[PDB]
Design a protein around this nucleic acid. Structure first.
Ligand SMILES: [Mg+2]
Ligand SMILES: [Mg+2]
Ligand SMILES: [Mg+2]
Ligand SMILES: [Mg+2]
Ligand SMILES: [Mg+2]
Ligand SMILES: [Mg+2]
Ligand SMILES: [Mg+2]
Ligand SMILES: [Mg+2]
Ligand SMILES: [Mg+2]
Ligand SMILES: [Mg+2]
Ligand SMILES: [Mg+2]
Ligand SMILES: [Mg+2]
Ligand SMILES: [Mg+2]
Ligand SMILES: [Mg+2]
Ligand SMILES: [Mg+2]
Ligand SMILES: [Mg+2]
Ligand SMILES: [Mg+2]
Ligand SMILES: [Mg+2]
Ligand SMILES: [Mg+2]
Ligand SMILES: [Mg+2]
Ligand SMILES: [Mg+2]
Ligand SMILES: [Mg+2]
Ligand SMILES: [Mg+2]
Ligand SMILES: [Mg+2]
Ligand SMILES: [Mg+2]
Ligand SMILES: [Mg+2]
Ligand SMILES: [Mg+2]
Ligand SMILES: [Mg+2]
Ligand SMILES: [Mg+2]
Ligand SMILES: [Mg+2]
Ligand SMILES: [Mg+2]
Ligand SMILES: [Mg+2]
Ligand SMILES: [Mg+2]
Ligand SMILES: [Mg+2]
Ligand SMILES: [Mg+2]
Ligand SMILES: [Mg+2]
Ligand SMILES: [Mg+2]
Ligand SMILES: [Mg+2]
Ligand SMILES: [Mg+2]
Ligand SMILES: [Mg+2]
Ligand SMILES: [Mg+2]
Ligand SMILES: [Mg+2]
Ligand SMILES: [Mg+2]
Lengths: 197, 386, 114
RNA sequence: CGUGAAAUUGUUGAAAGGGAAGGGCAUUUGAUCAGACAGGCCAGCAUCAGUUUUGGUGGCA
RNA sequence: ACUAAUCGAACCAUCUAGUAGCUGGUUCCUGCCGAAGUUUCCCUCAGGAUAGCAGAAGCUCGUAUCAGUUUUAUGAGGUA
RNA sequence: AAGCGUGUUACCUAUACUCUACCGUCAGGGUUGAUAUGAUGCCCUGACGAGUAGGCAGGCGUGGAGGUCAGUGACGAAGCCUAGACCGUAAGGUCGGGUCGAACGGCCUCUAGUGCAGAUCUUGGUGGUAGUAGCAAAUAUUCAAAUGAGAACUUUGAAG
RNA sequence: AAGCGUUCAUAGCGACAUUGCUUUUUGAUUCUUCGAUGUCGGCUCUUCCUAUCAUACCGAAGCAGAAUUCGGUAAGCGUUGGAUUGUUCACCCACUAAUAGGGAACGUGAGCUGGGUUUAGACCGUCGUGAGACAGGUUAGUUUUACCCUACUGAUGAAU
RNA sequence: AUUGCCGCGAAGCUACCAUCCGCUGGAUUAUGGCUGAACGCCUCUAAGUCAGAAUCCAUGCUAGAACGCGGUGAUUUCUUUGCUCCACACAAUAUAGAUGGAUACGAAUAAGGCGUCCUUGUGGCGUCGCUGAACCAUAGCAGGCUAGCAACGGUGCACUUGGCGGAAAGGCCUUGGGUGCUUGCUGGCGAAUUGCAAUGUCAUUUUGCGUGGGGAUAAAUCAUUUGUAUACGACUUAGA
């Protein structure tokens, strides 16, 4: 119900999350995906690397520049999954795709915005325990994506500042909860409690 | 059905498209891997290919049947006057790729690099960098505000240099401006190097030494439109062939119903950027001295310039690099000399070279004298009057 | 009408690669411009403010000749003449309907506006 | 040289144009246009009839 | 081979709109009904006649002699 | 599992089914002492509607003919143009504006050389291709002057 | 898996049987093309497949070494020069690491060539009374057009 | 003498007929192994894992999306007194679709968060989840005028102090003062007629135009010219 919904791609199955995103864009929702390098695919890494090599060999024989485009980045791999669940050749499909941004890591300004998940598509909630899976960043680097290291480096710098921010927020919510704790037993507090608040 | 007889493909698919280069100055696509321990130094140099000469040297290659005996080898001379450092650029690592964050320039720029930013220099008011030259007014307070930015950020530091084309015998008057990655030392030390070297001249012997494997980066000689027989080296068709024989007979099967990208077809030949590697330096010649072309075994007070000047180029009055063999490009052409991207240890590298004799006969013909004194000695007195 | 014309540098003035120098066409046009400026002077029009407001070239009836082809064939060899006409000129220097509830809002805006 | 069509063309004006264009159903937008005051236009609610759909509850075997 | 760009029988005109079981085309709207490629015969097999299928005109009458169906009863058959 | 096997519901939507309206077709009927004058008219009731080849029926349009409207018209007939309007399911019909200049319609009948997208259809006209392919055999032209609106091409002189 | 393999079915083979795959054989069919998709071979050039000749790394052997044979991943990279023949096919000489097999309208004729087939001239043999016949031999015999669109190779370029 | 012929012939082009040069990292296949159950043993495999092919992906090389992006330089007056930035005044232009708030740890899930304590751990104890059904916010002529009480808070506006943030920072945390409002509590007045409903107009891009307050005072193309280029364009040069 937010004007922009930011989805943290970690722990998400790629086809189940992108089918969720496809319906949201066609229903008019702006969706931003971050940490697409942390997406997941069911099946072993070698099995998924074999499927990308079957994709890699598909090219227009008389001119490889006009053929299928094999995008290596996890955000663009995610985008290719989305296309196929969106009628991208129509004007409505191009308007839906204009409502989506995907990213490796969390660039600004999404670093300081709340991220959500899709339990309808989470790997830990959909896969059976003991089933092998694959991380998109590992798959992408195996097929020529060149920025796993700098994404991992810049994510570490972001996580340090984010952890520092949460400590200064843990302290503030601790004080706020203490002020609410002493506010109880008053005249207003007992009326709110009898009214469910 | 199959080809009925196997042959290797004509041409190399990795040098495609065989189109004209986007600029005459070929761009450096890769710099040597940076080792932070070493002192801060340039990784490339800019020079103008003057021409070729011939040397004699003793081969030091054990096992070779010509070991310890003289060989004659072709060399290429590139006029390399000391380039001027005029600026610095910092590059921040980004998931989208390397990206420049800011650039700093020297307070004063030479007219030969101010010409570069112009198409009509004579018509111009010469207004370039006038307001940037006012940033140095009080103490250059805006300049250290940007150098501190490069030091804090910018995991890569490059330096802006320009050639001293006013010293080379060219007819251009306008320098070539390039970026050279600055290897060694911390990010601060690279910026420290750049600040100390603003408005200064960096010589070629500070970058390169003798016997060093270096890379040549230049746009090759142009040949205009060319047919498939010379552009790709395909077989000439027989004499009986109607409607052309300098062609390719079959440019595809019926299916796929298209000409494929891998079929040899006519078009532009030459004027392509090329990066040739492993070119040993034979002489880091100094310009501020006679006996440029002298060796230990010659002791003749002659310069590197042949007897009558380099053909289509001119003399040499500056520092130069003698490099073994041929390098891409032609005479008068800007070339990038780049340090090796790997340490080669195959006894061709690591083979110290001592020149015995450098050919200084005229390349304008079948020149049979090295110096004017030698010509006057052999011929004697002529009718030409003093 | 420019398919398979040569390219020239002088088309940069107009943003095209294909431009030519139709000397015969230019002479006919500038003859008519000189005639129109004569009419403007005769009419009393001020020449420093004149500009080509309308110029139109139409297809005239064609002039027929023959050309002789291989294997005893005859094809047309035909001119494409022009009708030309041009004009020079001097450069020259709501009941609204509202419903009852719309008018009431405008009344309610005015009696509290300052 | 009566009238002076179409194919095809010029000028002007309007519109749209990521490897055709054209069309069918429906609507938005822009343009343009006909009629009616002695009911014309678009609607809201209540009580009914016809055809349905979705609930709540009651009594029996 | 050649016999006026014409030759295994020139050119011109007429008979001549020569015949063609063969190819192509066969021009307004709406409404109702609505097929056949199967029988026999033919120097028959790219055709026709004949019977069948279809339309139209109806006529004599007015719920029946009836029926791409079953049951009951009684036959027949020589395939699984 | 968004795979396989099986089971239970909910849901989606055909020009199919049900109900209603409207069109047409068919069938069965009503309707004359003013049917409160259309009896091939008005009205009631029920059912039905795919369609090539093909058959039949009812209509639209064109040239000319008999009759009629004592029809239209130089105060504009016919024609043509018109992302202007209306009527008809349709064939089509009617009107407004522009252009034009001399004849032309409605209705009842008669008559036919009577309706076109095709036939490598006929005749004529026009396109894209397209300012394109090309205007390259025969050795070769140049300078000045004259004439002229205009000279590579005319004339004369000089040269080759 | 009966046997061969000195003994030992399966190192390598493998009878009698039996299950398949492929569409580079040839049959079989006649669906497309008879207002025509240029019918052999070669040359040239690119690409694809693997049922791998060589090369890389391996596993097995009746692998002591050397050399071989069988098998795996594997089509990345190569797979030739000639005598004869129009030949595809074939055979031989020789080099080589190897001289593996195929597809792409039996790839490729507005790319060529035209030796062959396959028009019209002519000869021979057989057959036919004859005109003539012969997937029998022999010799001579016109190989057209791109300037359009796409594709491809190169070259400009408005707008930010 | 259609380049008359012959010998030599610079320059240019060109030759496995000449010379130079043609990079090294990771992940893997087959296979061989480690540990190790199923199956108390065994086992390269089931979970994990080592090495390893002319393989693959990178390094490197070629091109650079003409609708991918970045950094930097200069940006036109006495040249229809032009250009740019800021503010407010009026017009047009449209909206892939505002209608209180996109409300920020990280990791795991056969585990975690929060709080507390210690001997600072892979610790003890308590508690929570079982969905955001939350939290914050939210009363007033679309939100008026005004009197107080309590408190010294909340919050808006510009202004100011300091710091942090380069992945696309363009935002976050702040000090201090001024100026409003406050629904934390108690009052007084006003609202009607939009007539029984008509989104009943409150938003944000862009383009101009005018007004008044700052700021700067160029290039590019053609034409000429070069030949490191070239069919033409283009490219590379030069000219007050
Ligand atoms: Mg799809
Ligand atoms: Mg790549
Ligand atoms: Mg082969
Ligand atoms: Mg590179
Ligand atoms: Mg020929
Ligand atoms: Mg030379
Ligand atoms: Mg063209
Ligand atoms: Mg041409
Ligand atoms: Mg052209
Ligand atoms: Mg001709
Ligand atoms: Mg006329
Ligand atoms: Mg017309
Ligand atoms: Mg449409
Ligand atoms: Mg409309
Ligand atoms: Mg005769
Ligand atoms: Mg006839
Ligand atoms: Mg006839
Ligand atoms: Mg029927
Ligand atoms: Mg019948
Ligand atoms: Mg029987
Ligand atoms: Mg499905
Ligand atoms: Mg019908
Ligand atoms: Mg008639
Ligand atoms: Mg009239
Ligand atoms: Mg008249
Ligand atoms: Mg007729
Ligand atoms: Mg017609
Ligand atoms: Mg031409
Ligand atoms: Mg001639
Ligand atoms: Mg059949
Ligand atoms: Mg054909
Ligand atoms: Mg195999
Ligand atoms: Mg073929
Ligand atoms: Mg062909
Ligand atoms: Mg041909
Ligand atoms: Mg022949
Ligand atoms: Mg063409
Ligand atoms: Mg051609
Ligand atoms: Mg002669
Ligand atoms: Mg050699
Ligand atoms: Mg073990
Ligand atoms: Mg670009
Ligand atoms: Mg309030």
């Amino acid at each position: 119900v937010e004007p922009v919904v930011v989805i943290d791609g970690k722990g998400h199955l790629v086809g189940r999350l992108a089918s969720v995103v496809a319906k949201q864009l066609l229903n008019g929702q702006k969706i931003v995906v971050v940490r697409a390098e942390e997406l997941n695919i069911s099946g072993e890494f070698f099995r998924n690397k074999l499927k990308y090599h079957d994709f890699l060999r598909k090219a227009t024989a008389f001119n490889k520049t006009r053929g299928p485009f094999h995008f290596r980045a996890p955000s663009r791999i995610f985008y290719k999954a989305l296309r196929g669940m969106v009628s991208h050749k129509t004007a409505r499909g191009k308007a839906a795709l204009e409502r989506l941004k995907v990213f490796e890591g969390i660039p600004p300004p999404y670093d300081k915005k709340k991220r959500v998940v899709v339990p309808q598509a989470l790997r830990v909630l959909r896969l059976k325990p003991g089933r092998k899976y694959t991380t998109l960043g590992k798959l992408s680097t195996s097929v020529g994506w060149k920025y796993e290291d700098v994404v991992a480096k810049l994510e570490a710098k972001r996580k340090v500042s984010s952890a520092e921010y949460y400590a200064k927020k843990r302290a503030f919510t601790k004080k706020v909860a203490s002020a609410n704790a002493t506010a109880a037993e008053s005249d207003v507090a007992k009326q709110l409690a009898a009214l469910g608040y | 059905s199959h080809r009925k007889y196997e042959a290797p493909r004509h041409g190399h698919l990795g040098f495609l498209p065989r189109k004209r280069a986007a600029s005459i100055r070929a761009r450096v696509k890769a710099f040597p891997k940076d080792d932070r321990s070493k002192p801060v130094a340039l990784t490339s140099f800019l020079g103008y290919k003057a021409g070729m000469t011939t040397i004699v040297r003793d081969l030091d290659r054990p096992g070779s049947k010509f070991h310890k005996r003289e060989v004659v080898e072709a060399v290429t001379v590139v006029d390399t006057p000391p380039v001027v450092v005029v600026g610095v650029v910092g590059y921040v690592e980004t998931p989208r790729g390397l990206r420049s964050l800011t650039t700093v320039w020297a307070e004063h720029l030479s007219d030969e690099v101010k010409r570069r930013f112009y198409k009509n220099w004579y018509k111009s008011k010469k207004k370039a960098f006038t307001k940037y030259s006012a940033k140095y007014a009080q103490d250059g307070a805006g300049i250290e505000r940007e150098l501190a930015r490069i030091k804090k950020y910018a995991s890569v530091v490059r330096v802006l240099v320009h050639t001293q084309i006013r010293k080379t015998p060219l007819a251009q008057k306008k320098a070539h401006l390039a970026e050279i990655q600055l290897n060694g030392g911390s990010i601060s030390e690279k910026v420290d190097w750049a600040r100390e070297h603003f408005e200064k001249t960096v010589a070629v012997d500070s970058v390169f030494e003798q016997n060093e494997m270096i890379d040549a980066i230049a746009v090759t000689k142009g040949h205009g439109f060319e047919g498939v027989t010379h552009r790709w080296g395909t077989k000439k068709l027989p004499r009986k062939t109607h409607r052309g024989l300098r062609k390719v007979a079959c440019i595809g099967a019926w299916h796929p119903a298209h000409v494929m990208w891998s079929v040899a077809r006519a078009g532009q030949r030459g004027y392509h950027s090329r990066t040739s590697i492993n070119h040993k330096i034979y002489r880091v010649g100094k310009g501020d001295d006679e006996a440029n072309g002298a060796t230990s075994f010659d002791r003749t007070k002659k310069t590197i310039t042949p007897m009558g000047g380099f053909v289509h180029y001119g003399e040499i009055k500056n520092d130069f690099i003698m490099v073994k063999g041929c390098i891409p490009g032609n005479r008068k052409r800007i070339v990038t000399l780049r340090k090796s991207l790997y340490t080669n240890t195959s006894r061709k590298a690591l083979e110290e070279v001592s020149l015995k004799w450098i050919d200084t006969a005229s390349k304008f013909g079948k020149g049979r004298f090295q110096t004017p004194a030698e010509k006057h000695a052999f011929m004697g007195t002529l009718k030409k009057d003093l | 009408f420019n398919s398979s014309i040569g390219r020239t540098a002088q088309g940069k003035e107009f943003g095209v690669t294909k431009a030519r120098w139709p000397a015969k066409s230019v002479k006919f046009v500038q003859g008519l411009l000189q005639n129109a400026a004569a009419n403007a002077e005769a009419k009393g029009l001020d020449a420093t403010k004149l500009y080509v407001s309308h110029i139109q070239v139409n297809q005239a009836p064609k002039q027929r000749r023959r050309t002789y082809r291989a294997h005893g064939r005859i094809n047309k060899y035909e001119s494409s003449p022009s009708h030309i006409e041009l004009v020079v000129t001097e450069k020259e220097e709501k009941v609204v309907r509202l419903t009852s509830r719309q008018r009431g809002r405008i009344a309610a805006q005015k009696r509290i506006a300052a």
